[PDB]
Amino acid sequence: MVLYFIGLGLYDERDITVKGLEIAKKCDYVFAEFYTSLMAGTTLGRIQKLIGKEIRVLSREDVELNFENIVLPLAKENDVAFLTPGDPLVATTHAELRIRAKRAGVESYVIHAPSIYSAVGITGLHIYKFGKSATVAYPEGNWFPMSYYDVIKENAERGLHTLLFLDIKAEKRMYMTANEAMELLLKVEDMKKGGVFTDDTLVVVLARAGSLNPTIRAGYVKDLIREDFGDPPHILIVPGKLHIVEAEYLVEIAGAPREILRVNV
Amino acid sequence: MVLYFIGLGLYDERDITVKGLEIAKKCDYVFAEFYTSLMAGTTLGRIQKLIGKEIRVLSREDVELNFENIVLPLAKENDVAFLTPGDPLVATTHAELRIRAKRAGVESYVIHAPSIYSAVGITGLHIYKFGKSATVAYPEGNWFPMSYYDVIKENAERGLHTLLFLDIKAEKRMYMTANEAMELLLKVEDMKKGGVFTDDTLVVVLARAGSLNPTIRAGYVKDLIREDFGDPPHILIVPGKLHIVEAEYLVEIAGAPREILRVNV
Ligand SMILES: Nc1ncnc2c1ncn2[C@@H]1O[C@H](CSCC[C@H](N)C(=O)O)[C@@H](O)[C@H]1O
Ligand code: NA
To answer: Phi and psi at residue A182, in whole multiples of 5°?
Structure first.
């Protein structure tokens, strides 16, 4: 008679917590969505095998418009789980789903999992130094979203790092690369001309966090703009003022130009 | 020849990921540190039992001063694990440890786990709206730290939420409560008069994240300053202006007063 929101983690089926696995294994019905993010190292089958249950995948429409019609009814007489990539409530609108559950008289519980939001720690950038985050969305027709540019500007002025979630169109199997994000930012810079994002801007790229061998690279846009960072998902980070040790890690671990070791205090 | 940084997650021994557990079980040596944080929902014994490996606990000094002569030597000819609460490399100084590994000719890999940085998503507050984070430390002697007040001021001023970690004396097993943090902030407000933290400030308290029954409370300081939020650890958040959807979640899930739907939106 309950609903469990269970995160599956960053890259493969083993990124689920032990708590999440043991609970999922005992649920009567298991649903999931794979449109909010991409788990590049697993398949629905591998997940089903690990959990030992048939998994009904839902689309954004199924969830956003029919969650209370598809999932909640069953949670009133059974133990139901709703699986999602990463952490269920991070950079998704799934939190609001708990409100729907309450209104339907269904109790819900949240089982966390590793999230890209905290995985940024592997870049060596102090996580407390990150400021407001933003999403780089694909332009549509004549609509060209640019608010993420102002977020970088606001953070940079305060010496804070900017995390940039990248766009995803699961149904079209489109996953925005860090390269595409950099190209869009240069276009916005050309329009706004604020000196926020240029060829000399230092950026950090993290691809496939969660895998044992993620791609972690740091450098100037002019040099990374066309570099191959591997398969998606990717996130782009625009660091603010660096601490000496952040710079050292980027150089030693992310192959950044030794030049950044020298910081302008 | 390999060092694995493995996160133990948020609250109990089941918060480690499947990947983290399986890798730990295959390691010849397993070290752990519990000074950055403590798994309040479990014990060293239970973690040891789950992993099926003797766990050698390391102090802050063992790690910060002697990581290269305590952990790395063994990593040269064996597979070694270094367990930490939360997600590895979140603690400010841990990233640098990977530099030490490289310098020692030891390959290192990171196995992620849930971190409070992403788990706070359970408060219903959008992750992208969080700004710079900080820690509330106890005053002592002629030292009354209050920079965390400025962090709140700069974040709120830009409509951003402030995540506040509370002081902890690991060895003495003493946790600062949300109540104490609030009292301290009111004192800082009294000395700075910035109109940043007062009795009418809306705050959110998250205690025992990771647990299946966490305490999520939201309301004005005047009402929560003396409320019992249960056993530690406690996390305090001073939200910025709320999105109506954030407000509704706090009211419906965190028991916030209806008043926030008009006053803090
Ligand atoms: N393993 C991974 N590596 C790199 N970026 C990732 C990632 N997982 C998610 N992202 C980034 O975040 C976006 C999804 S946003 C949803 C995030 C998810 N709830 C979590 O907790 O991680 C992706 O488009 C990508 O830009
Ligand atoms: Na943050």
So the answer is: -65, -40
Count of alpha carbons within 13 angstroms of residue A160, beta-carbon side: 25
Half-sphere exposure of B184 (CA within 13 A, CB side): 22
Q: Which residues pair with B80 in a beta bridge?
A: B3, B29
Answer whether B127 sits within 8 Å of A119, measured CB to CB.
Answer: no
Cα(B121)–Cα(B124) distance, rounded to whole angstroms?
6
- B265/A contact by beta carbon, under 8 A: no
Experimental approach: X-ray
Question: Encoding tokens for residue B218?
Answer: 């939201």
Determine contact: B65 vs chain A, CB below 8 A.
no
**Domain A115-265 adopts which CATH fold?**
3.30.950
d(CA A79, CA A2): 5
Residue whose pair of structure tokens reads 């780089």 in the numeric block: A136
Q: Establish whether residue A204 lines the binding site of ligand 1, counting it when its CB lies within 6 angstroms of any ligand atom.
A: no
- What is the resolution of the experimental data for this entry, in Å? 2.1
Burial B94-127 (b: 16+ CB within 10 A, else e): bbbbbbebeebebebbbbbbbbbbbbbbbbbbbb
| Closest ligand 1 atom, residue A168 Cα | 24
Backbone CA torsion sign across B137, B171, B5, B103? positive
Cβ distance B132 to A14 less than 8 Å, yes or no, reads no
Question: Which ligand does the CA of A180 lie closest to?
Answer: 1
What tokens were used for B118?
């992403």
- What are the phi and psi torsion angles at A249 (to 5°)? -65, -45
Of the residues B122, B148, B245, the best mutation for testing chain A's interface (the one with the most A CB atoms within 10 Å of its CB) is: B122
Residues A211, A11 contacting (CB under 8 angstroms): yes
What is the Cα–Cα distance from B170 to B181, expressed in whole angstroms?
Answer: 17
Is B112 in CB contact (< 8 Å) with chain A?
A: yes
Give distance in angstroms: CA of B236 to centre of ligand 2: 14
CA–CA dist B156, B240 (Å, integer): 5
Level-2 CATH architecture, domain A1-114: 3-Layer(aba) Sandwich (3.40)
**Lookup: tokens for A64:** 């956003």
Residue contacts between A and B (CB atoms, under 8 Å): 180
> Chain A contact for B113, CB < 8 A?
yes
The CB of A232 under 6 Å from ligand 1? The reply is no
Residue A4 neighbours by CB under 8 Å, 6+ apart? A23, A24, A27, A79, A80, A81, A82, A108, A109, A110, A111
- Provide CATH 3.30.950.10 ranges for chain A: 115-265
How far apart (Å, rounded) are the C-alpha atoms in residues B65 and A64?
51
Buried b (16+ CB within 10 A) or exposed e, A235-257: bbbbbbebeeebbbbbbbbbebe
Helix locations, B1-87, DSSP H: 18-25, 44-51, 60-70, 72-75
Specify the domain boundaries for CATH 3.40.1010.10 within chain B. 1-114
